[PDB]
Structure 1
Amino acid sequence: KEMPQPKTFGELKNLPLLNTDKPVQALMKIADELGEIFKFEAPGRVTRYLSSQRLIKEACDESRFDKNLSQALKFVRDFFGDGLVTSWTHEKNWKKAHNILLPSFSQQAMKGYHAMMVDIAVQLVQKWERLNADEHIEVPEDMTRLTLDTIGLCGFNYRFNSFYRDQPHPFITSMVRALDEAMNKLQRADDPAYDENKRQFQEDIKVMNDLVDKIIADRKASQSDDLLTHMLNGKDPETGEPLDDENIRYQIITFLIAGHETTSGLLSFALYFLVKNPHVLQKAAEEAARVLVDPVPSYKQVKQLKYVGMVLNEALRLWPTAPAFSLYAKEDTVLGGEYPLEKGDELMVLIPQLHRDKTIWGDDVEEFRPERFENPSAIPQHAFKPFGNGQRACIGQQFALHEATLVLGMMLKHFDFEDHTNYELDIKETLTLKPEGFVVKAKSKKIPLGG
């Protein structure tokens, strides 16, 4: 079969159809018109977007396709190096860090992290219990406070103390401002008009490096067992090698950013869909009230919040917060019996489109219906992939979902929510998705906390 393709405009190819800062959302609308696969060309580059479970399942066969570094990931590699997210599966440093870091997400590790997660969740609830009449909550801003602090604490025994600041931690502002200047620099014709941009970039990189320096120095000057411990002390069983110090610095930055942004998005989306679907908010609050009987939640109690877990999966269905991942053909091959590819050809999984495949989910794909996930073992493999695929799947998946389930649980135990502005979904796309400007009011149910 000839591969569908949007209209090309001479040497600009398909680039005129993607002049937006919401290109995932734009590509979903091209998918709706062209179907399960389309080629997209810009000057310099070609990739093929996949939207069906039929073809994604084939693309997920790791004997034929491996993880690719998309244009975004190649850019980001300048900051994150050969950390876990930005390495090739054929880079020595990928498998080496995988083996050394996997145990930080063992069952005994998750249990270990739970009291630390509770510490941060309790700070969120207290903040909201402390608001005055008529005050409101900036939802993704407060979710980012919680998730940054959680990964700093759990991963690194470092307190960002985000709840003590009315603005973002400088680490976050600096990361974002350095990323933005690196992108902005890419499209500039050394006019000394850019002397301040360059000084600010050097300041921003120094804030990041100073933090990483401190996390490492503080720990060496200190007994712990967390991610940072395995980074510093762990040896790969395959080779006996430890991480080198360059790679360690890349892993710390990698984990501080990856370990919070998508989880903050998920919590923001989940509360959005709850306030827009009040019969579902009622069902999830009934569960939270029935299960979370103690002043603070135990591990076991979080695991019992089944409907809250369904909520979160349904939010990840509709708006997976890392919405695309990329693959390449390891050898010449034919995709779906219909589409010849050459070695090296790039495929992009458009996760939110996959998650709208009506052949799999039925026609109600735009409905927020957590009951979909009642029996998740019956969902076909590769229909639902908010955590990517195979050996390059999310190492943080259980961490993210425990944090989210604990925090959403506690939120729904402690407050009623109001969508006071009748907020209109506006999804901002960066390295992740978030409902920009999402705000609510909370009214305390006056249930006390444990001390």
Structure 2
Amino acid sequence: KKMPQPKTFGELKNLPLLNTDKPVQALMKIADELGEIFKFEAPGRVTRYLSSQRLIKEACDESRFDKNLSQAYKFVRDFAGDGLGTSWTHEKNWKKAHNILLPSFSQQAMKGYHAMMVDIAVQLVQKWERLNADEHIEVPEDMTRLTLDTIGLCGFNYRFNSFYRDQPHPFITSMVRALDEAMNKLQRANPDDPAYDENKRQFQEDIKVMNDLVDKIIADRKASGEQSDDLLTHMLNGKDPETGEPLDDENIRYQIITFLIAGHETTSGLLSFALYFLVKNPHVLQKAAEEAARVLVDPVPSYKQVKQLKYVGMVLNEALRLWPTAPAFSLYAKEDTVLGGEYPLEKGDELMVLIPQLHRDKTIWGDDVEEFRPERFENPSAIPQHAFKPFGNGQRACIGQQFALHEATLVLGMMLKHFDFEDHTNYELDIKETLKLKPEGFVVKAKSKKIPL
């Protein structure tokens, strides 16, 4: 069986297809016309994009495939180091950090972070309470303020104070430039070219900004001895049950940088896509608003109250079905194997899981796959294995899934409790692609229900 392949550009093969502002969306269109699998070649590089549950069910077999670092995350590693997201499974510090960090990311551990998530959520609500009549809300911009600040507070008890400023904290500024520089290197034909020599100076400066701040807070915390409810405390007190060793101060720094990279843009995008689908689907918004009002009976939401926001949780999952904000992940074959009984792979062959296309597999979801219907998730046990993968797969799945969903349910719950929303511009969906997806330019007007918090 020979594999489909999109149009080629002579000696560049398929690489110019990714020289665009919206690569994932272009890859989705390629998948529409070529089907569940297609070969994608580049100068000295070959991968295969998978879109169907039948094949991705096999790619998620951990005995046959392990996480691969895409070229994007190899560049990100220049400042995320061997934190969890940019380390290979076989690296000593992956398993060690995984064993140490896993209990601090459980559903149960969310009880400890709850109060500090509420702290930033109340700031978001009060900001919107304090808008004048004419004014509107820049949704992704404000959601990103919240998620950066929430990860800052719960990650290492640091306040970026994003709601007090127009230009973000220098760390946030340096991190976004670093991610941006790592992204631009993907489509950069000439290395070492002097036009980017300043890009390299800025990169090294941005790395130092990030490292200086994180190393100082770690050092300050070690001298202090203070015990807080943050991940930094757990990392300073944790030991790997396997090796018996703790994480050293450098890898702890890479973990903190990792949480901010991995968590802030994905969770921001989810809240923004969720609010977008709600205003485009007023019957769903009303149903979710009715739940928010019924459950959140106190001025400040409790951890137990957030767990009762079931429909809000279904809204978040349906937003993740349509636009998973971390839209692709890479795998490699551990040994020679046959995929789907018709595609032979050699040891080391790479695969890409195109999550937005998986989530549109009509044989799983039916024919209305493009419709926003959270009720698709009223009985999750009916969904076949590996059909819904917004948080990746296996031991290399998202360690922050419970943190992300608890924050998003908390924040969207309070939003629906406190405001009615207006799609005052009839916003047309425009999905900007960094390494993550978000709706660009999405704006709304909020009218307060005047409920004290």
For this structure pair, what is the TM-score category when the shorter chain's length is used for normalisation?
A: over 0.9
Determine if the alignment matches structure 1 residue 226 to structure 2 residue 230: yes
Instruction: Give distance in 2, aligned partners of 1:286 and 1:205.
Output: 46
Unaligned runs of 5+ in 2: none
CA RMSD of aligned residues (A): 1.7
Instruction: Give distance in 2, aligned partners of 1:182 and 1:413.
Output: 39
Structure 1 residues 200 and 234, CA gap change in structure 2 (3 angstroms): same
Question: How many residue pairs end up in the alignment?
Answer: 449
Instruction: Give distance in 2, aligned partners of 1:434 and 1:215.
Output: 31
Q: TM-score, normalised by structure 1?
A: 0.96
Instruction: Give distance in 1, aligned partners of 2:43 and 2:194.
Output: 30
Structure 1 residues 274 and 182, CA gap change in structure 2 (3 angstroms): closer
Structure 1 residues 346 and 377, CA gap change in structure 2 (3 angstroms): same
Instruction: Give distance in 1, aligned partners of 2:98 and 2:38.
Output: 33
Structure 1 residues 18 and 178, CA gap change in structure 2 (3 angstroms): closer
Q: Residues 143-200 of structure 1, C-alpha deviation per residue, up to 9 Å, x if partnerless? A: 0111111111112111111111122222122112233345556777878766654543
Structure 1 residues 447 and 423, CA gap change in structure 2 (3 angstroms): same
SS of equivalent residue, structure 1 residue 311: helix
Q: Residues 64-118 of structure 1, C-alpha deviation per residue, up to 9 Å, x if partnerless? A: 1111111111121111111100111111111010001111123442111111111
Structure 1 residues 149 and 7, CA gap change in structure 2 (3 angstroms): same
Deviates more, 1:194-203 or 1:368-377: 194-203
Structure 1 residues 220 and 45, CA gap change in structure 2 (3 angstroms): same
Determine if the alignment matches structure 1 residue 422 to structure 2 residue 444: no
Structure 1 residues 414 and 192, CA gap change in structure 2 (3 angstroms): same
Deviates more, 1:10-19 or 1:36-45: 10-19
SS of equivalent residue, structure 1 residue 434: strand
Structure 1 residues 363 and 183, CA gap change in structure 2 (3 angstroms): closer
Do 2:72 and 2:186's aligned partners in 1 also have CA atoms closer than 8 Å?
no
Instruction: Give distance in 2, aligned partners of 1:273 and 1:107.
Output: 26
Deviates more, 1:93-102 or 1:12-21: 12-21
Instruction: Give distance in 2, aligned partners of 1:351 and 1:97.
Output: 26
Deviates more, 1:134-143 or 1:189-198: 189-198
Do 1:129 and 1:444's aligned partners in 2 also have CA atoms closer than 8 Å?
yes
User: Structure 1 residue 310: deviation in Å?
Assistant: 0.4
SS of equivalent residue, structure 1 residue 401: helix
User: Structure 1 residue 7: deviation in Å?
Assistant: 2.6
Do 2:79 and 2:207's aligned partners in 1 also have CA atoms closer than 8 Å?
no
User: Structure 1 residue 437: deviation in Å?
Assistant: 1.0
User: Structure 1 residue 378: deviation in Å?
Assistant: 1.7
User: Structure 1 residue 218: deviation in Å?
Assistant: 3.0
Instruction: Give distance in 1, aligned partners of 2:58 and 2:42.
Output: 25
Do 1:274 and 1:280's aligned partners in 2 also have CA atoms closer than 8 Å?
yes
Q: Residues 320-371 of structure 1, C-alpha deviation per residue, up to 9 Å, x if partnerless? A: 0000011111000000001000000000000000000000000000000001
SS of equivalent residue, structure 1 residue 108: coil
Do 2:429 and 2:439's aligned partners in 1 also have CA atoms closer than 8 Å?
yes
Q: TM-score, normalised by structure 2?
A: 0.95
Matched with 1:198 is: 200
**Quick one: which of 324, 328, 334 aligns to 2:332?**
328
Do 1:109 and 1:226's aligned partners in 2 also have CA atoms closer than 8 Å?
no
Structure 1 residues 199 and 69, CA gap change in structure 2 (3 angstroms): closer
Task: Map 1:18-97 onto structure 2 (within 5 A).
Answer: 18-97=18-97
Unaligned runs of 5+ in 1: none
Do 1:387 and 1:397's aligned partners in 2 also have CA atoms closer than 8 Å?
yes
Instruction: Give distance in 1, aligned partners of 2:2 and 2:97.
Output: 41
Determine if the alignment matches structure 1 residue 381 to structure 2 residue 385: yes
